[PDB]
Structures are given as C-alpha cells and as structure tokens.
C-alpha cells in the first residue's frame, strides 16, 4: 500500500536520527553536557533547532487545512514571533546567560522566590506532557489511513524511537538531529508546493488567481475588532502574547538561548530562526491554497464530506511518486520528532533544576543528576507515549502559559515588584483566564493576553502590600 521504496525512505531517516543520538551520547558526562550541551554548540545549529522545536506536524497540517478552508490572515503570527526577536534579545537573554540557567525559571527564584518558580516549572512540564500526546496523535491520524499499519505501532515509531534518540543523544544530539528535521520539513514543504503546482492547469499562476478571486488571501472583512471572532486584529494580539510566551517563558525554546559560547552566537540564533520564519510558514500556506485550486480543478478527487484535515496527506500518497512520498513523509515525522525530542529534554532539564535539585535538602551528586537527567526523558515519553495512544484508542493546563508569560514581564519590567505581589498576580491571573474560558464567549485569542497581563497589573499594585523588591 505505502511502498517498499517509500518505507526504506523512512526507515534510513529514522536509522540516521538513531546514529545522531549514539554518536552524541560520547560526551553525555554530565548535567551540564545534557542539558546546556558545553557550550559546543554553534549559533545557526540552535537557530535551526529552535525553529525546527517550534514547528511541529500542528504547523505541518493544520496550517495548510488553515488555508484551505480560509485564508492566510493567521501568516501574520509568523511575522509577529520575527518582530519580538530583538525585544527578547535586549531585555531576557542578557538574565538568562548571566544566570548560566539550566532551566529558564531559575530565573524567576532569582527575581521573586521559588513559589513562581514552581509554579511556571510544573506548568511548564505538564503541558509539554500534552504536547508531545497531541503531536504523536496528529501525526498518526494524518499517516494512519495511508501508511496502513496499527496506530499503536505508528506511534512507536513516532514517539518511542525519538525517546530512544533523545535519551541518547542529550540536547546535542537533540539540536543536531533537529538541524536534519528543519532542513528536512523545510525542504519538504517547499517540494510539496512545487509538485502541486505542476498539477494544477495555469500552475502557479492559477493557484494565486482562483485564491484571489476567491478572497481567500486577507479578506478585507477581517480587520475588524471582535471579542469573539479570530479576526485580524484579534488573532494579532493573541499571537503577540502568544510568541512572547514562546520565546521568553517556554523552556524548550529558552534553553536554546544558552547552548551557544557567546552572545554573538546567541544573536545569530534568533537571526538564523528569524530567517526561516520569514520563509518556510508562507509555503504551508500556500500549499492550502494550492491544494484548494486543485481539488477545485479535480471535484471528483475528494471523498464526499472528507475531512479537511487530512486533504495534504490525501495528496502526498496518492499524487506523489515513489521514494518522494517517503521521503514527504520522513519530512512529517522530522516536524513531529523535532518538537518531541526538544520537549522531552526541556522537560527533564525543568524537573532536574526545579524538581529534583532544588526541592531536595542535600546537594545531588554530579551522578545523580545525570541519573534523574536520563530518567525523566524515559518516565515523561513514556506516559505522554501512552496518553497519544488513549488520545488514538478512544485546555485547562495550557491557560497557565499566560500566567506564566506574565510573570517574567513582570520580573524583567516592572522593578518595584516583588514575590508576594507575584504571588498574588498569580492566583488573579489563574481565576481570570478560567472566568475568561469558561465563564464568557472571549475568542481563545485574548487567553494569553489576559494571563500575562493579570500578573503584570495585579503584582504592579500589590507591590506595596509586601517587603522590597529583590534587586537582581
Ligand atoms: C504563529 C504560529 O502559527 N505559531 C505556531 C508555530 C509556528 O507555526 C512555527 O513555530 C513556525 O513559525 O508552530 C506551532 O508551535 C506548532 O506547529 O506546534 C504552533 C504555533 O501555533
Ligand atoms: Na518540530
Ligand atoms: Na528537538
């Protein structure tokens, strides 16, 4: 059904990904190899990585079906994340080096006090739990009706081999295997795109034609406030607070701040991230327009009430030659394994930092925290293995992302604030947004806007109620 040459594709991915991760686990001695990997690691390789660690199969399907359906107006998130760069550059990075940070809310101790360090750590580590589930899971209802396997073992293939790589390699072997990813889905998605145009008569230039015509661009009816619709100006807002999130409160992302040797390394891997996010995102938009032409073109090659959702991997395998579909393929398994493996160590540096080394009375060994180092990446695959097979077989911790968000705009702007008014921005910030999720028909857009900006107001007043400020 799939293919011999196809699979063979696959597999010699899958075994290179593997020899990555042997190779690297060489100079795994310590927790400081594992996590902040020496300092070894060049700024365009974590440029590369952090790109690859953001883009999962989330952005690999569902923009295109974004596209499909609708428009392009969400494309703008992708320039917003660009915009912060030099923002998070100035003001965080500089704390997060100096800290020398294993993970990025040790530096929320530094500021407040270990309350808001837990609190953004656990959050941090149980929704990336999540997100590893949900990404394992996307990835198999995309392949699962045109590889023709169990979705249990599809999942193994997924999730357990990138464990196993993971496990091995530390974060080198996770930045170097993502180096390959990026470039991989990149690639893919550009290849993807080309080969849609050479099946839709008037090529390229139709697809922008019968798009256009169809307002399925930038509709000018889009810009518009609304409290409730995922407008222009609203999704603006929210994929503002969004990217702030990304880039300055989530550790899979932070930790790539501080792999490089200098700050000139680390300018280069906001630069080199930024250069792939100007680029690489408009192909998977426009592979849903493209795709839309398409199937306009040929009505007859879309099962009646198909879900839209799988209409990139309805193309890939049935319009798409042989060891080139594979290696499409390989390319979503690299969207997908990039941004489990970087979860799963990011995981594992949190609970070694905020867990396992802060919270115990004694100093652990330079053993024992390579031991927990090693062993959280298996306890945390493992389960979040299992939840994408009940997800298969068969929202409230995401809220905290602005409280989290909030808390370091806080530290980082707001001097006069102080761990108790954290603290109490905090719990104001977690009973708004769930009065905003629940409680109200806010578009899910203002979330994160609500979060992070709770904790800045709330602990900016409350600041008098408690002792000084740390000074940091
Ligand atoms: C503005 C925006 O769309 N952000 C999305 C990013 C970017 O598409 C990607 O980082 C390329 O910049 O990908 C995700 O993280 C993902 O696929 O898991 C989802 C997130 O919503
Ligand atoms: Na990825
Ligand atoms: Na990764």
Redo the contacts with the bound molecule.
């Keep these: 059904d799939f293919g011999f040459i196809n699979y063979a594709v696959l597999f010699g991915y899958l075994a290179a990904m593997l020899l990555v991760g042997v190779y690297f686990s060489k100079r795994q001695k310590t927790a400081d190899d594992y996590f902040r990997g020496g300092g070894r690691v060049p700024g365009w390789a974590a440029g590369v990585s952090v ?1 690859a660690t ?7 399907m569902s ?1 295109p079906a974004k596209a499909y359906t609708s428009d392009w107006t ?1 494309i703008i ?2 320039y ?2 660009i915009a912060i760069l030099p923002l998070v550059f100035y003001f965080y990075i500089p704390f997060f080096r100096k800290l020398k940070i294993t993970s990025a809310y040790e530096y929320l101790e530094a500021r407040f006090d270990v309350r808001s360090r837990l609190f953004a750590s656990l959050s941090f580590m149980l929704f990336h739990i999540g ?1 590893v589930a949900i ?1 394992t899971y996307l990835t198999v209802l995309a392949l699962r009706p045109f590889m023709g396997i169990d979705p249990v073992v599809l999942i193994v293939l997924i999730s357990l081999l990138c464990i196993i790589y993971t496990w091995m390699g530390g974060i080198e072997g996770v930045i170097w295997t993502d180096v390959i990813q990026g470039l991989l889905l990149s690639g893919g998605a550009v290849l993807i795109f080309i080969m849609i145009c050479f099946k839709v008569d008037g090529g390229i230039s139709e697809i922008f034609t019968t798009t256009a015509q169809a307002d399925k661009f930038f509709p000018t009816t889009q810009w518009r406030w609304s409290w409730t619709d995922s407008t222009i100006p609203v999704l603006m807002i929210g ?1 503002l607070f ?2 702030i999130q ?1 880039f300055t409160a989530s550790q899979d992302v932070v930790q790539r701040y501080i792999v490089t040797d200098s700050i000139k390394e680390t300018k280069r891997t906001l630069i080199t991230n930024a250069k792939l ?1 100007a680029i ?2 408009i192909f998977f938009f426009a592979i849903g327009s493209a795709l839309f032409v398409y199937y306009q073109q040929n009505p007859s090659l879309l099962p009646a009430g198909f879900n839209t959702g799988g209409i990139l991997p309805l193309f890939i395998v049935t319009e798409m030659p042989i060891g080139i579909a594979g290696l499409i393929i390989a390319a979503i398994f690299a ?1 997908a394994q990039s ?1 489990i493996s970087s979860s799963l160590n990011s995981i594992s540096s949190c609970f070694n930092s905020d867990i396992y080394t802060r919270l115990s009375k004694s100093s652990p060994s330079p053993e024992q925290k390579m031991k927990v180092a090693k062993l959280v990446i298996i306890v945390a695959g493992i389960f979040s293995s299992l939840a994408a097979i009940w997800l298969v077989l068969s929202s409230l911790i995401g809220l905290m992302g602005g409280p989290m968000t909030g808390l370091f705009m806080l530290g980082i702007f707001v001097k006069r604030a102080n761990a108790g008014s954290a603290v109490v921005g905090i719990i104001v910030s977690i009973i708004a947004v769930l009065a905003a999720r629940y409680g109200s028909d806010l578009n899910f857009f203002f979330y994160g806007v609500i979060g992070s900006m709770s904790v800045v107001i709330a602990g900016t007043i409350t600041a008098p109620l408690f002792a000084p400020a740390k000074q940091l």
């Design positions: 790109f953001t883009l999962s199969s989330i952005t690999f923009i969400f998130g992708q917003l994340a997100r990404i994929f969004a990217n990304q996010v690489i995102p969207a941004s």
